[PDB]
Amino acid sequence: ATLKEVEMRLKSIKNIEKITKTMKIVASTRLSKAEKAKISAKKMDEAEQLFYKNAETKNKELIVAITSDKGLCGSIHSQLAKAVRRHLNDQPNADIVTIGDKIKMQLLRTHPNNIKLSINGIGKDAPTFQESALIADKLLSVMKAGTYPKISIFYNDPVSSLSFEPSEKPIFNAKTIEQSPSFGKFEIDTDANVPRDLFEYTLANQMLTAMAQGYAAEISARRNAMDNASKNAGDMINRYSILYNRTRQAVITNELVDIITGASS
Amino acid sequence: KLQFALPHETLYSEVTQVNLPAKSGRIGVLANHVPTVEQLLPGVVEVMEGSNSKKFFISGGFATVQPDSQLCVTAIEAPLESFSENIKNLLAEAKKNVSSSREAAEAAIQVEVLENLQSV
Amino acid sequence: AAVVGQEHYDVASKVQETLQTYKSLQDIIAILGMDELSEQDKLTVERARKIQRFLSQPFAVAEVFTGIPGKLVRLKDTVASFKAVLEGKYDNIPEHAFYMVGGIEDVVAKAEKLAA
Amino acid sequence: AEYFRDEEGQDVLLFIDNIFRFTQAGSEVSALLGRIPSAVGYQPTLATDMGLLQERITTTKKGSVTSVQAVYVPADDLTDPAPATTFAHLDATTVLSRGISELGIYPAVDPLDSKSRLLDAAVVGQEHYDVASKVQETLQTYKSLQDIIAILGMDELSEQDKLTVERARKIQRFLSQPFAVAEVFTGIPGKLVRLKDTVASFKAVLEGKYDNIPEHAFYMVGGIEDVVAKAEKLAA
Amino acid sequence: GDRQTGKTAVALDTILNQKRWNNGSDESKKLYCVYVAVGQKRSTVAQLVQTLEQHDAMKYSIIVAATASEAAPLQYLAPFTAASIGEWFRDNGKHALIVYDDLSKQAVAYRQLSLLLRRPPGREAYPGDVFYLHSRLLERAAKLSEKEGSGSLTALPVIETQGGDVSAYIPTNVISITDGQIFLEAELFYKGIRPAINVGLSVSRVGSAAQVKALKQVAGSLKLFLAQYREVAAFAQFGSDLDASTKQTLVRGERLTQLLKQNQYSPLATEEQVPLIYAGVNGHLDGIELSRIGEFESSFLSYLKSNHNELLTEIREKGELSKELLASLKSATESFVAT
Amino acid sequence: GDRQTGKTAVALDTILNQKRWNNGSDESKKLYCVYVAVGQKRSTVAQLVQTLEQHDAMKYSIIVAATASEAAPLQYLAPFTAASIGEWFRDNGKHALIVYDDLSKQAVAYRQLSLLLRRPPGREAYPGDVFYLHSRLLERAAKLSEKEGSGSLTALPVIETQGGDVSAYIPTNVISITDGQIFLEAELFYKGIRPAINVGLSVSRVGSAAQVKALKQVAGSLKLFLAQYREVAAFAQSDLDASTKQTLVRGER
Amino acid sequence: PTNVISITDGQIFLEAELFYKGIRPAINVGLSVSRVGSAAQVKALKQVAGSLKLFLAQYREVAAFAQSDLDASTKQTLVRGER
Amino acid sequence: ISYAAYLNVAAQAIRSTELQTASVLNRSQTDAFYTQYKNASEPTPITK
């Protein structure tokens, strides 16, 4: 009736509450590992950035994006999509390498023409050098990485363990090395294959850091989202409780009408 | 100095002398060094912080002296002693792999890594 | 289907199914955002929101009250109008376009009006 | 039963079906008697009538009489006053969950709602008592773990937890044992299994001793010999 | 289940498929069906007789009627006098079926009548002894032993639940008496099962021991798959990536539900229900995409009608599936992987 | 507390500890307990009797018995009757403890009487002056003034909650009248925590006013720790702050 | 309440939520209707006020589903509605 | 082969005495796949 329709919907809400609780807790567990990775990685990355800065960082482009395969990230997938979308007005023909299914869906809508490479098995794992390296090896061959004047990577920088700002950076190519001239304030021999090697090595080193930052932000957002869900569900629980109680009183009052029938006897 | 770094751990990212195996032969850095980039090959490495010397087996990476005497080192994974028998097992695999042949690079690297570890 | 035709019955069936799902996902819609709804569903839900808005028709007696000239839509027109919308042909246009309008032609025209 | 209890001076084992019908019947003649029916139309003297029936059924020094009274719970709500009044009056409650029946487990008993006032180390002995506590926990863990299994998946779960779930599933289908009255159904005669045998076999499962025995090789079978045999049967 | 919403239609379907047995000779296969209509308008009845004449089943139908206008005593008296008419067949050794649609309005008639009779008490305003009235009525339908009789009156009571309020006194009373409950759910009706039977709450206590032997074999794990589908589906709409095995269940389950669906006023031959359940249970349809399930059903049956019509004859004629017949059937399905 | 969830057991435990004082020669501190078995079958009360005999408690215990079989007028007057026995003790200046188990069944009996006497039903179909009835019973218990002699009649009513329905009319009235409530929780009972007390939903309104000074000192902390433990039960599937882990550990132990 | 509503032509439901949350007049326009008074007005107050009832029941709807991707049309309505 | 693939392969080789941590083993063992795309249309997904 009323009573049952309240109760079944309330049960749905309850079950959801339990699931979001469960998810949030498991998310916290995952979050520590995700965050841990980004510190070590970020420390490693900065040392290379020290070179690139001092060298000067001076520049069809590539877009790489990072999400997990897994969903319930939060709005990571579509906020990242939005920060891509602005620069997909600035490059509507950009070739997108999608590291993760979730960003793939949003971008796939925006231009399926752009979708050229995608990588599975991302979301399941926590970012690893093996993956980054293999992706790097494939990037050169598949995407013809060298063609772009500079690559660009989009990821989610985990600003705080309650926040995420989607962030991007440009991966510096051999072209960058070529026309940066304060590379000469780090001079090495022509015999050294250091431009073509350093390009590849920091192609991956930058990418891994971006992935770690993204993964931590993703898991962080998921925790935040699942916490807020639990809260929203509580409010609805309370609203249906008040309705339930009033309905219970009204059924008792109708029973009191039956008592009044007994009074007629 | 020395700012030895791996993605999974950071080993030094001061460290008075670092001895590095490079495509530029062997490079030693003590205090300030002239401002260079050197690609680190798969390596046997010595790192000295003071006179104390630590002996490392390294998967190659990159080395880049910053002109502020900050030796930015990036490599994938390291101790030499921890690595030092399975490498012999690996040699059997590597020989087998060479029989068939990226596989060429794999077998070549496995033999190379073994030789380089074997060197110490 | 033997009265108002199989095509009508099929069309109506899809409307009923879509709306019942949409009603079912009302819980989910509130607890978890629109985005967090599955992609296949997110299209369906968006379609259903449009359909929901589509159902309004200004009346010719309440034309005064709504302030919108009343639109009376032929039965022959109706089956056609929903059929197209269900195939999402005109779906790509505001929920407002579907709100308080008559025939399919009117929706299209009001999209042009809204576009201005 | 009194003639048996008293005059034949014997123990009995009474069976009545269904006592909701007993409740319903009295309510109707309350109304026909014009006596204002109490809550949810149930007779005023419901408690006291039930009480006379229960009081009559007891162990005296003349005999012992063991009633099994079926109770039908309308729309499976036990706070309905007629079931609730009966809920107090009985000593060894059993709930048969529709869900568990549907899972194909016959017995359809809900093992988390099976309650008997007697169940202690003083009653069934310390081993029995302890084992039954472990079973309850194992099953309760399995039920709790259904939520983790639900979203993350069975595969995505802790190793300790996974062995507990797997064992609980083995216990779950251990319960399923054939009935003589499910020769009509399954065609498999009932299986009488001694107390000691059940305690021993269940202990083994919990320890993981019978983790070389398939989950389904506990399904709808009785005895340990059969459980082992059905592992072989499935194996072959 | 909820009033009028195919409430009439479920019953008419039973009458219609029993045309096949009825046309055939042997009086035990003949159901001399009695449709009892209480509280319904003359126009509704007129439509009913028109439908029955359209499907030409009036050739064995009896319509006992108590229209809305007809007196509250006459309405009260209507089930009990319908029962006697049925008993004449039953007594004769003949099999028959009595549809009592809807007893809920009979109770109201006895409510109004009893209150006008000054009958003092009443749960929900229905005086006690309505259960006595209804119970005696329902217990007057039976399968009679060969020694004493040979007829079987079958009864189908129909109770229209007021907003699904099953705790209502009259629905509660009936539930105890009856040998099955066939809950129908409105949401599932809209969801596209038309009629929609909520099998989760529907039961048949006697169950399989009156199900066709072949159909008993095939639908053995159909129940298990569906039951699992219900549980799995409930968690599954939280849109998490479940185990692939779990999504196998989900996929298999989705297809099964769609398979069950059938349109009003269309009966179906048992010989052509055995294949569909075999196919489904043997998971061939689990693969076949949800949208084109309807296409598969129609076409598969047409395909067997064309080619494996020998096979169909055997299932019909012998009503059991040999190892060979099960294999033949499997092969036929595989051959029609076209969809 | 929850229905038949060893309600009688929790109560019976108190009586056994009263054996310690009873054995003692301090006659004011000889609490002559009264158990009021309402609608409890003669077999159940026989078990009670045997358990009491086993624990040698029958020699200060009084059991006023109105069993399930025993008629509703007797049941109606049964708690009132019991109180009179207590008054004699109280009047003699002694102390005693009367455990009314359970007033929920008293309500039903009064209902049976009231409806048969054509007195109207009231909230939750219990007669309207059930409030007045309960209030009359529950105010008889009391610790008298010094001039009127230092005596008392301690009381501990036992109330059965249908499913924990504290909303229910008979619980709400009673909850207000008594100074304190203890609310046992079924999950805890099942989880083997017997007593199954839900600490949050157990409060005493006079409480620590009567408490041993020593015991007061070493159990203020206990209240605060447990309070934190309830909140800090909220993890399962992580690694927690050292403070949180300490709380969790303290709470679990 | 329903008995009065059905007799009366037009209703002017007021919401506590709006009252508490400032907004006096606190007159919910979801549940305020006038079904006879809309032709009792001077033409000036018919002309100026045209379809504003729809607009603020578009604002009501808009902020219902506002609680990410909001098109300029919806944003415009929201901006106008709030103001 | 590419320098970072070359170095990667070396790191993987280097974790084979085997006396290496879980993070190392995870860092040098991935079963991840990669779905190539073109146009929309996907050249088949295959182990990375």
What SS3 state is found at A126?
coil
Partner residues linked to A165 by β-bridges: A157
Beta carbons of A38 and A216 less than 8 angstroms apart:
yes
> Coil, strand or helix: which one is F173?
helix
Residue B56 and residue B27 in one domain:
yes
d(CA A168, CA A214): 10
* Residue of B51, B37, B46, B40 lying closest to B18 (CA atoms): B46
- The encoded tokens of residue G34 equal 């006038």
What are the strands, taking DSSP E only, across chain B?
Answer: 3-5, 17-22, 25-30, 37-40, 43-49, 52-58, 61-66, 70-75
Number of Cβ within 10 Å of residue E25's Cβ equals: 7
Both tokens of G60, joined, read 């009501």
Tokens for H26, please give them.
């995870």
Tell me how far apart the alpha carbons of residues D198 and D191 are, in angstroms, rounded to a whole number: 12
Please tell me the distance from the alpha carbon of residue F54 to that of residue B95, in angstroms, as a whole number.
84
Nearest chain F alpha carbon to D43:
F112
Distance between alpha carbon E299 and the CA centroid of its chain, in Å?
25
Q: Does B68 share its domain with B98? A: no
Does residue A19 sit in the same domain as residue A31? no
The strand pair at A163-171 and A95-99 is best described as unpaired
CB atoms within 10 A of CB A98: 27
Q: How far is CA D223 from the centre of its chain?
A: 19
**CATH-assigned architecture of domain H1-48:** Orthogonal Bundle (1.10)
Nearest to A22 among D34, D36, D151 (CB): D151
Q: What CA–CA distance (Å, rounded) separates G8 from E41?
A: 35
Contacts of C34 in chain E (CB under 8 A): none
Quick check: E5 and E186 in contact, CB under 8 A?
Answer: yes
CA A7, CA D28: separation in Å to the nearest integer?
A: 31
Structure-block tokens of residue B52: 């104390």
Catalytic residue list of G? 35
Q: Tell me how many domains chain B contains.
A: 2
Contact F76, F116 (CB under 8 A): no
Q: How far is the C-alpha of B47 from the C-alpha of B80, rounded, in Å?
A: 12
Measured torsion, CA atoms of residues E331, E332, E334, E339, in degrees rounded to the nearest 10: 180
Give dist(CA F57, CA F33) in Å, integer: 9
Q: Binding site annotation covers E91?
A: no
Residues 6+ apart with CB under 8 A from B87: B113, B114, B117, B118, H16, H17
Q: Which amino acid is present at E187?
A: E
For chain C, the chains sharing at least 3 beta-carbon pairs closer than 8 angstroms are A, E, G
First to last CA, chain H: 15
Q: What is the CA radius of gyration of chain H?
A: 15
* DSSP label of F142: E
Let me know: does E22 contact E116? Beta carbons within 8 Å: no
- What are the residues whose beta carbons fall under 8 Å from the beta carbon of A224, sequence distance 6 or more? A74, A162
- Which residue in H has a C-alpha nearest to residue B61's C-alpha? H7
Residue pair B116/B94 in contact by the 8 Å Cβ criterion = no
Q: How far is G17 from chain A (nearest CA, A)?
A: 15
* Residue A169 φ then ψ, to 5°: -155, 165
For chain E, list the domains and their CATH numbers.
Answer: 1-211 (3.40.50.300), 212-339 (1.20.150.20)
Measured between beta carbons, the chain A residues lying within 8 angstroms of D158 are: none
- Ligand-binding annotation for E5, yes or no, is yes
Cα dihedral: C64, C69, C73, C77 (round 10): -160
G47 in contact with A at a CB cutoff of 8 Å? Answer: no
Cα angle: D43, vertex D49, D51; to 5 degrees: 130
Q: What are phi and psi of E95, to 5 degrees?
A: -100, 145
Range of the domain at A255: 1-25+226-265
- The label of the residue with tokens 């006879």 reads G36
Of A201, A193, A45, A42, nearest to A137 by C-alpha is A201
Nearest chain A CA: its distance from D172 CA (Å) = 23
Question: G15 to each of D40, G12, G27, G55, G66, how far by Cα in Å?
Answer: 38, 10, 6, 19, 21
Active-site residue flag, F118: no
Interchain contact, H1 vs B57, CB within 8 Å: no
For A255, half-sphere exposure in the C-beta direction (CA atoms, 13 angstrom radius) is: 20
- Interstrand relation of B43-49 and B52-58 (parallel, antiparallel or unpaired): antiparallel
Cβ proximity of H28 and A130 under 8 Å: yes
Coil, helix or strand at residue H40: coil
**E26 among annotated binding-site residues:** no
Q: Is E253 exposed, middle or buried (0-12, 13-18, 19+ CB in 10 A)?
A: buried
A75: closest chain G residue by CA: G68
Q: What is the separation of C-alpha D4 from the centre of its chain, rounded to a whole number of angstroms?
A: 28
Q: Exposed/middle/buried for A7, CB within 10 Å: 0-12, 13-18, 19+?
A: middle
Residues A220 and A232 both lie in one domain: no
Which residue of chain A comes nearest to F119, CA vs CA? A263
Q: Residue D178 CB: number of other CB atoms within 10 A? A: 19
Contact call for A197 and B62, based on CB within 8 A = yes
What residues form DSSP beta bridges with F100? Answer: F36
For residue E128, give the nearest of D29, D75, D103 by CB distance. Answer: D29
Q: Hey, CA dihedral for A222, A224, A230, A233, is it positive or negative? A: negative
- Contact residues, chain A, for G68 at CB < 8 Å: 75, 78
Give the bridge partners for E98, in sequence order: E34, E155
Using DSSP, state whether F7 is helix, strand or coil.
helix
Q: Do B95 and B79 have their domain in common? A: no
In terms of phi and psi (left: phi > 0; alpha: psi -120 to 50; beta: otherwise), the region of E192 is left
G58–C33 CB contact, under 8 Å: no
Inter-axis angle of helices E169-177 and E130-138, to 10 degrees?
30
What kind of experiment solved this structure? Answer: cryo-EM
Please state, in angstroms and rounded to a whole number, the distance separating the CA atoms of residues A178 and D216: 68
Strand partners, E156: E99
List Cβ neighbours of F209 (8 Å cut-off, separation of 6 or more): none
**Parent domain of B69:** 1-84
The number of beta carbons lying within 10 Å of the beta carbon of residue A169 is 18
Record: contact A233-C31, CB cut-off 8 A: yes
**CA proximity to A45, closest of A192, A213, A175, A190:** A213
Q: Which fold has domain C1-116?
A: 1.10.1140
- Cα–Cα distance measured from residue A100 to residue E164, given in angstroms and rounded to the nearest whole number: 47
Tokens, residue G68: 């990410």
Do chains E and B have 3 or more beta-carbon pairs under 8 angstroms? no
- Do B100 and B68 lie in one domain? The reply is no
CA angle A74/A80/A84 to nearest 5° reads 160
Task: Give the C-alpha distances (Å, rounded to integers) separating E44 from D13, E47, E48, E49, E67.
Answer: 55, 5, 6, 9, 9
**φ, ψ at F240 (rounded to 5°):** -130, 165
Distance CA H41, CA H44 (A): 9
Instruction: Enumerate neighbours of E (3 or more CB pairs within 8 A).
Output: A, C, D
Structure-token pair, residue A34: 């995700």
**Which chain E residues touch C21 with a CB distance below 8 Å?**
191
Token pair of F106, please? 């008293």
Q: How far apart are CA A105 and CA D49, in angstroms?
A: 68
Tokens linked to H19 = 């006396």
Structure tokens at D109: 């008993």
Please tell me whether E249 is known to bind a ligand.
Answer: no
- Which tokens sit at D135? 């079973």
Rounded Cα distance between F231 and F251, Å, is 10
DSSP β-bridge partners for residue E288: none
User: Is E325 exposed, middle or buried (CB count within 10 Å of its CB: 0-12, 13-18, 19+)?
Assistant: middle
| Residue H12: closest CA among B64, A193, B93, A214 | B93
Give the 3-state DSSP-derived string for chain E, with helices as H, strands as E and coil as C.
Answer: CECCCCHHHHHHHHHHHCHHHHHCCCCCCCECCEEEEEEECHHHHHHHHHHHHHCCCCCCCEEEEEECCCCHHHHHHHHHHHHHHHHHHHHCCCEEEEEEECHHHHHHHHHHHHHHCCCCCCECCECCCHHHHHHHHHCCCCECCCCCCCCEEEEEECCCEHHHCCCCHHHHHHHHHCCEECCCCHHHHHHCCCCCCCCCCCEECCCCCCCCHHHHHHCCCHHHHHHHHHHHHHHHCCCCCCCHHHHHHHHHHHHHHHHHCCCCCCCCCHHHCHHHHHHHHCCHHHHCCHHHHHHHHHHHHHHHHHCCHHHHHHHHHHCCCCHHHHHHHHHHHHHCCCC
Q: DSSP E strands: which ranges in chain H?
A: 33-35, 45-47
Distances (CA, A) of G52 to C98, D22, G55, G56: 18, 66, 5, 6
CA nearest to D151 within chain A: A19
> Which amino acid is residue D57, in one-letter code?
I
- E146 and chain A: CB distance < 8 Å anywhere? no
Q: Which residues does chain A have within 8 Å of residue C35's beta carbon, measured at their own beta carbons?
A: 75, 77-78
Q: Calculate the dihedral angle through the C-alpha atoms of D22, D24, D27, D33, rounding to the nearest 10 degrees.
A: -80
Residue owning tokens 């929903």? C82
User: Total domain count for chain A?
Assistant: 2
Q: What letter does residue D182 receive in the DSSP assignment?
A: G
Catalytic residue among F20, F118, F205, F253: F205
Is some CB atom of chain A closer than 8 A to the CB atom of E240? yes
Q: What is the CB neighbour count within 10 angstroms for residue C102?
A: 20
| Alpha-carbon gap, residue D26 to D50, rounded angstroms | 10
Using the 8-state DSSP alphabet, how is residue B27 labeled? E
Residue B104, C-beta contacts closer than 8 angstroms, at least 6 positions apart:
B98
Closest CA to E85 of E107, E103, E106, E100: E100
Q: Does A126 touch chain D (CB under 8 A)?
A: no
**Contact indicator for B41, B112 with CB cutoff of 8 Å:** no
F168 min Cα distance to partner chain D (Å) = 12
**Rounded-to-integer distance, Cα B12 and Cα B21, Å:** 18
Same domain, A10 and A104: no
Answer whether D37's CB lies under 8 Å from D88's CB: no
> Has E3 been labeled as part of a binding site?
yes
* Nearest-neighbour CA in chain B from H33: distance (Å): 18
Task: Please name the CATH architecture into which domain D119-236 falls.
Answer: Orthogonal Bundle (1.10)
D18 forms beta bridges with none
* Neighbours, chain D (3 or more CB pairs < 8 A): A, E, F
User: Can you read off the two tokens belonging to residue G11?
Assistant: 């209703």
Q: Is E6 annotated as a binding residue?
A: yes
Q: Which chains touch A (3 or more CB pairs under 8 A)?
A: B, C, D, E, F, G, H
Helix (H) or strand (E) holding D232: helix D224-235
Cβ–Cβ pairs < 8 A, chains B and H: 60
Judge contact between E193 and E298, C-beta under 8 A: no
Interface test with E, best of D28, D157, D220 (most E CBs within 10 A): D28
